[model samples]
Target: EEASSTGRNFNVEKINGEWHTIILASDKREKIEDNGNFRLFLEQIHVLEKSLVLKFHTVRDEECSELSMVADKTEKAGEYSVTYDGFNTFTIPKTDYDNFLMAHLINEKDGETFQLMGLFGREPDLSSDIKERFAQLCEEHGILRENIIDLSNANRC
Candidate 1:
């Protein structure tokens, strides 16, 4: 019921006993072609050294705490560029929703490679084509098939 080229895609799965969600932009556009009902937003913004910087509180009460007014915390965790358009904002593309998983997994820092494991959890809403792609990526990254969740099933997602 929407345009063919706009939207943000999202997925949530309970993996290894915890729940996690991932949101992704549709293509390189802000957000319109993906599937999630919600979009990630930056509640705060500022200009630093000329380029714009974004800020958000992961989880908080009425008053935002001192995660030190954390801005682009992903960059804080790892050095990556942050970009924002009039409607969409994103980093190195870390979601299966946007079809960015292959690049992300292949290029992730060796120390962070373990986090890629999260991608293998049952995202039963994804397409089989993508599931196979994920499996291929696993092989490229040296992740054993036995280590992946739903290793032989793509239809479950």
Candidate 2:
């Protein structure tokens, strides 16, 4: 019974003396997997700066985490910028979420071409569904990402 936009269209507002924004599951949520050559497309945003909505209706706590504070800590492990909007809701920065992932990817590959394996296993509820969705979205991002990386790699070579 709610509406949201897809693909890099959202606003950030400061509310209650703090920044606030809605976080729907990303439109890119399902496209989380890509061919090896395509992993770099969404590397910047998906991993390093994508905003994710935290509505309990679609986003479940049992599926996300048990401890409120620890859920953020757990989610943060995978590169998310999040805040509770009070009353079982969360606000997240698309930009920071994305950066968190990019940072993790860089760490994994030792700062080579930024690539993500897409799972940090930080929570038991990080779940198969989330993994599958992320893998699919990663595919689309990967195509474009790898092409860019390929060009860059060739340039360096």
Candidate 3:
């Protein structure tokens, strides 16, 4: 069977005289109640021109009317040629986009009280799909199946 299009890649567009955000990945509705400790979705934002700035925002609660700046930097697909202020913000040139899309697997085991295992990706895929992919890669490398960590499948904090 063939897979359906997810239309996951986001793009940057020029509107009027300025650049605008085209799309941002949304967190799964079931995970909305998550205490901001674990992120189930990964967002890949595209930067067309090298210096365009995009502001990030968040809703602190369901009753609020405003979104607040939740970070002190930007997030991007690759290294930056230039950058501007604030959290979770990033600037990437078209040349370095492929490098910027690399993903990292993290295992933060502080104690029994809190732990985190997750895949930080430049694209969004179902968590289970990502786990299976990781497992396959591990097998190809002769890594023991029991030793490969599937942080994406582990329970949250």
Candidate 4:
């Protein structure tokens, strides 16, 4: 049997754009409650032009809306250039940055969860499929398996 793949590498970085992860921390529905921490799904997004900006929500120190991407041409792949107003600017490589990002996100331990919607074209895939892919990768890499929640459940939070 042939193995299926997402056909892209997750080791790339956003030179100037942003790579933010948001886990659905908790949710309430139909008198049921669900709560847990989540790890972000890895992604390899194609950036058409530099200096691009996308909008995301629930970011730190942000109010309802936030800038999701920016473009820069003076940086190498896996490295990024950050711009904040007119007083802040810096460069960070993904290698150095991702480790810290993941560490802060707590990619360790069991029953932990994270969400990523990186590769999508209009409608998104079933959440279960998205997480199952990650679970497979972790197992292949000698990592232990654990629960990965998704919309597949009757009421996922």
Model 4 agreement with the true structure over 74-99: per-residue lDDT tens digits: 45432233342222122221122221
lDDT, model 4, position 142: 40
lDDT of 3 by residue, 1-157 (tens): 1111111243433111211111111222222223342232233233345433322222233221222222222244432222112112222212113222222222223322221122233322234554555445434434444443332222211
Q: What is the C-alpha lDDT of each candidate?
A: 0.29, 0.25, 0.28, 0.28
- Candidate 1 residue 70 Cα shift, in angstroms, is 6.7
Candidate 4 Cα misplacement greater than 4 A, ranges: 1-48, 59-63, 71-75, 78-121, 124-127, 138-157
TM-score of each: 0.29, 0.23, 0.25, 0.31
Which of candidates 2 and 4 reaches a greater TM-score? 4
So what's the TM-score on candidate 3?
0.25
User: Better model by TM-score, 3 or 4?
Assistant: 4
Candidate 1 ranges with C-alpha deviation above 4 Å: 1-115, 118-124, 150-157
lDDT of 2 by residue, 7-30 (tens): 134232111011111111222323
Supply the global lDDT for candidate 2.
0.25
Top model number, lDDT: 1
Candidate 3 lDDT:
0.28
lDDT for 157 in candidate 4 is 17
